[PDB]
C-alpha cells in the first residue's frame, strides 16, 4: 500500500536523473515552460565543460591545433563574466572543433569533466540558437549539485511511492533509514578508469558504499536493487580503456559484455549474507526513459512479490 | 555523513 524507496550512491552516479525519470514516467512529465526553466542550467553545464577542458590543457601541457584558438580561449573566460550570446557560441564552436582541445577531451580521465559534456557541445548549433527551448532529453542531461534529502511522491501500479534522493545531517539519518521498503543503489560504470583524485579509485569508493549498505542490519528486510548505470558511456569507454585500470587482477577481455559482468560480480560479492538476501541487479541508462521505464517496472514487480510473501500471501 | 553513519 505504501512504499519507502531510497536512492543511494556516489556523486554523479545517476540518482537525481532517476528522479526526473519518475516524474516523466509516472507523472505529468515536463511542460514547455518547465523545460524553459532549465535553459540556464544547460547553458551553464556547457560553459563549465569547455572551460574544464581548456584549463586541463594548462596542467597536461597541451597545445592548440592552431595558435588562433588562444584568442578564442581568452575571450571564453572574459565573456563568461556576463543566457547565450552569438559570439560566445562561435568562441566555443571554434574551440570544440580544434584538434587541440579535442585531444585534451579524449584524455578527460586525467581530470574532472562533465559526462554530458560531449552531448551539449556536439549539439551546440541547436542550443545556441536564440529563443531555443531545451528538449526533455536536454533536461535529463543537466547536472545539478543536489544537497540534502529530497523527497518525491508518485503512484505506480496502485502503490504510493515515497522516494528519497540522498545526496551533514545527524539525527536526520535515523529518521531516513526507518523501515525502508527498497534501496536503489546507483553506480557509474564509466567511472572505472577515473584517476586517483584520496587513495581509492572512484569505482572502489562505490564498492565501499554498497558494501556497508547491503550488509548493514538496517536493511535486513529491505529489497536491495543495484543500478549499474551509465552503460552507454561504459560501452564506448571500454573499447579504448582497459578494465585493469580499475581491477588490475582482471583477466577477461575488454568487451562490454564480459567487463560489465565482471563488475557486477565485484559488487554482488560484497554481499555477506548471500544465503538470506538476494540482490536485484539491472544494467541501466538513467537518461534513457524507455529503459528506466522497463527496469523500474521490473523493480516494482519484485517489491510487490515481496510485500505478499511477508504477510503470507505468496 | 550518511556513509560513516552506518
Ligand atoms: N550518458 C549517460 N549519462 C548519465 C547517465 N546517468 C546520469 N547521467 C548524466 O550524469 C549526470 C549525473 O548527475 P546526477 O545523476 O543528477 O547526480 P547524482 O544524483 O549525484 O548521482 C547528469 O548530468 C546526467 O545527465 C547514464 O546512464 N548515461
Ligand atoms: Mg544529485
Numbering used by the authors:
A (entry chain A): 32 to 113, 118 to 202, 206 to 235, 238 to 354
B (entry chain F): 4 to 9
Task: Give the text the authors published on this PDB structure.
G protein-coupled receptors (GPCRs) convert extracellular signals to intracellular responses, primarily by stimulating guanine nucleotide exchange on heterotrimeric G-protein Gα subunits. Upon receptor-stimulated exchange of GTP for GDP, Gα subunits undergo a conformational change, dominated by three mobile switch regions, resulting in separation of Gα from the obligate Gβγ heterodimer. Gα signaling is terminated by intrinsic hydrolysis of bound GTP to GDP, a reaction accelerated by ‘regulators of G-protein signaling’ (RGS proteins), and reversion of the Gα switch conformation to the inactive, GDP-bound state. Gα·GDP can then re-assemble a heterotrimer with Gβγ or, in the case of the Gαi/o subfamily, engage GoLoco motif proteins that are also selective for the inactive Gα state.
To understand how the G42R P-loop substitution affects Gα subunit structure and function, we obtained a 3.0 Å resolution crystal structure model of Gαi1(G42R) bound to GDP using the inactive state-selective phage display peptide KB-752 as a crystallography tool. The asymmetric unit contained three Gαi1(G42R) subunits bound to GDP and Mg2+; two of three monomers were bound to the KB-752 peptide, while the third (chain C) lacked electron density for the peptide and instead displayed switch region disorder characteristic of free, GDP-bound Gα subunits. The side chain of Arg-42 projects away from the nucleotide-binding pocket, making no direct contacts with other Gαi1(G42R) residues. Arg-178 is known to stabilize the leaving phosphate group during GTP hydrolysis; its perturbation in the Gαi1(G42R) structure model is consistent with the previously assumed GTPase deficiency of G42R mutants. We next sought a structural explanation for the disrupted conformational switch of Gα(G42R) mutants. As previously mentioned, the Arg-42 side chain conformation, as modeled in the free GDP-bound Gαi1(G42R), would not allow glutamine-204 to assume its critical position for orienting the nucleophilic water required for GTP hydrolysis. Superposition of Gαi1(G42R)·GDP suggests that the bulky Arg-42 side chain would not be easily accommodated by the active switch conformations observed in wild type Gαi1·GTPγS. The arginine as modeled would sterically prevent the positioning of switch 3 residues Leu-234 and Glu-236 as seen in the wild type, activated state. Thus, the Arg side chain likely sterically prevents a normal activated conformation of the switch regions. Our crystal structure models of Gαi1(G42R) indicates that this perturbed conformational flexibility is likely due to steric hindrance and electrostatic repulsion between the mutant Arg-42 side chain and residues of the switch regions.
